[PDB]
Structure 1
């Protein structure tokens, strides 16, 4: 009679967008002539440390929303989509009082009577099948590891010492020209000498009047050569010590049996994939490593792996194909 549809914010499945002016949905167009039939859902803004209380009607669309529209097209009923408060799947969590194991999130809102149907890619396991009934599994999707497969010359290299050498050779040329003024195309010849000492490859120049400036010139020559020698040496040794070995290739790696601060791998906090990895008793060390960096949402994991803060991430395969 009135079904309270609950869902979780999945990125390819539940696209949530703020309204244009007041509670309206922009009827956007796809590339196949299909208009985006959004639904007016009611969703929160951030988490409990994020926002104190901000729940507004916004527009939900995507994959599972169109699947629910197809279900309403087949069977005739009424519904209204509401969002879950947190952003977690739901774990068999121990509560304080009476030592009881409880469920939260979508299951915690469904079993308490606040919801009517969970619309989510639900992971079928032993604990959730013995409590509520299921349907036909529509999605068949496996796991994979998102990694980062990626010579710092001027533009990828940081911009301190380039401008420092430029201002240094500017000040050196200015004070050599000032000593050429106060002797114990003159400026063009001084610039030619200053950029020919730095040239380091051969030039047809001469020797200026350096009765009290030959020391500054020889120290600048040795200074420029020791800078370019140290720069060449540490760029070459850096790209030698840059290791191409980056791949993990699944659950099976003896290097991950004894990891370090380089082999970084984690998962989404309170996920059913983490429950399945906790269930297998031979996955103790990898579970202890994945619990070090438990991430709330998938967008934070994408931002971390894009900014080279991660090295490996456990996630479903077709969603990462869409992200690729």
Structure 2
């Protein structure tokens, strides 16, 4: 009740983590149409490198998802203290195999353990991944499109099905797309190749694609589209597959459930979601 501790992640355009100044406050960033942009103070590690033990001083968080969190707080009368993920991996069903037990990681593990539970982040909607936690109604849909360097038909293409040495394609490590590529027994020949290359976050894949590497890249639709929008050097190709939608998460029968879905459905109508999509997505250079 009352105080809720929430977990987020770093990926454009959902939550930037730009550091603050020495005093502690966050500088006033400006939006397109003459308004202040809401931002919160979010604590977390200082990435794998640098720092003392990855317990750095707070940073600033502001983007799409944070607006939804603030709207939920306004419509629910509750207070929050947002903190970042310890590792950064989205979280997939993993086996330690030292005790023949299945254990999660990242957001999923930090939700099931119980030290933080609102997961306000664009996770995924998945059949078996959400089989013992309760999702909510999606606030945005997407597909699994593929980005390439400045063409590929899709998942049915003999370059994708068999490389030899110079058409390597990878995805982010330990995430949702890995679950669906592993589960399909029909499509399981490529996954072994994908075990060779897999990056920790999206920025590494960006730098690989830009710097004459990673001939292909598979990720969510919205992130890829915004990526190809702002960065005018890579363009997407290939028709969509795995049509699904993002969503907020809660532990099994947490005592909010219903009101979250009601607020999501109400804000799906009127002008809230459209305003958010207009002000935080696209506005492209083409």
TM normalised by structure 1 equals 0.67
SS at match of 2:212: coil
**What SS does the aligned partner of 1:5 have?**
strand
Shift of 1:52: 3.1
Equivalence for 1:279: 183
Change over 3 Å in CA distance of 1:51–1:131 after alignment to 2: farther
Corresponding residue of 1:318: 222
1:145 maps to 146
| Contact kept? 2:162, 2:190, Cα under 8 Å | no
Secondary structure of the equivalent of 1:322? helix
Higher-RCO chain (CA-CA 8 Å, sequence separation at least 6): 2
Greater share of helix: 1
Distance in 1 between residues matched to 2:30 and 2:49, nearest whole Å: 35
Residue equivalent to 2:48: 47
Match of 1:105 in 2: 106
2 CA distance for matches of 1:130 and 1:48? 35
Change (3 A) 1:304 1:50: farther
- Name the counterpart of 1:28: 29
1:257 to 161, 174, 196: 161
Cα distance change of structure 1 residues 103 and 71 upon mapping to structure 2, 3 Å threshold: same
Equivalents in 1 of 2:46, 2:74: separation in Å? 30
User: Does the aligned pair in 2 maintain the 1:23–1:40 contact within 8 Å?
Assistant: no
Conserved in 2, the CA contact under 8 Å of 1:145 and 1:249?
no
Alignment map for 1:52-71 (pairs within 5 Å)? 52-71=53-72
Distance in 2 between residues matched to 1:74 and 1:296, nearest whole Å? 36
Kindly indicate whether the alpha-carbon contact (under 8 Å) linking 1:90 and 1:103 is maintained by their aligned counterparts in 2.
Answer: yes
- 2:42 and 2:84 in contact (8 A); partners too: yes
1:291 paired to 2:190: no
Deviations 1:222-241 (A, max 9, x none): xxxxxxxxxxxxxxxxxxxx
Deviations 1:186-243 (A, max 9, x none): xxxxxxxxxxxxxxxxxxxxxxxxxxxxxxxxxxxxxxxxxxxxxxxxxxxxxxxxxx
Conserved in 1, the CA contact under 8 Å of 2:93 and 2:129?
no
Structure 2 match to 1:302: 206
Match of 1:267 in 2: 171
Aligned twin of 2:93 = 92
- Cα distance in 2 for residues equivalent to 1:314 and 1:51: 34
The runs of 5 or more residues in structure 1 that have no matched partner are 150-246
- CA deviations on 1:260-308 (whole Å, 9 max, x unpaired) are 1211200000011111111101222211122211100100100010001
**Structure-2 change in CA distance of 1:92 and 1:50 (3 Å):** farther
TM-score, structure 2 normalization: 0.75
Please state how far the C-alpha of 1:49 moved relative to its aligned partner: 9.1
Cα distance in 2 for residues equivalent to 1:134 and 1:256? 33
Is residue 27–residue 38 contact of structure 1 (8 Å, CA) maintained in 2? Answer: no
List alignment gaps of at least 5 residues for structure 2. 229-286
> Match of 1:81, SS?
strand
Q: Distance in 1 between matches of 2:44 and 2:35?
A: 25
Deviation at 1:51, TM superposition (A): 6.2
User: Does the residue aligned with 1:62 lie in a helix, a strand or coil?
Assistant: coil
Q: If you compute each CA radius of gyration, which structure gives the higher value, 1 or 2?
A: 1
CA deviation string 1:101-120 (max 9, x = no partner):
11010111111111021011
Alignment root-mean-square deviation, CA: 1.6
| Cα distance in 2, alignment partners of residues 51 and 302 from structure 1 | 27
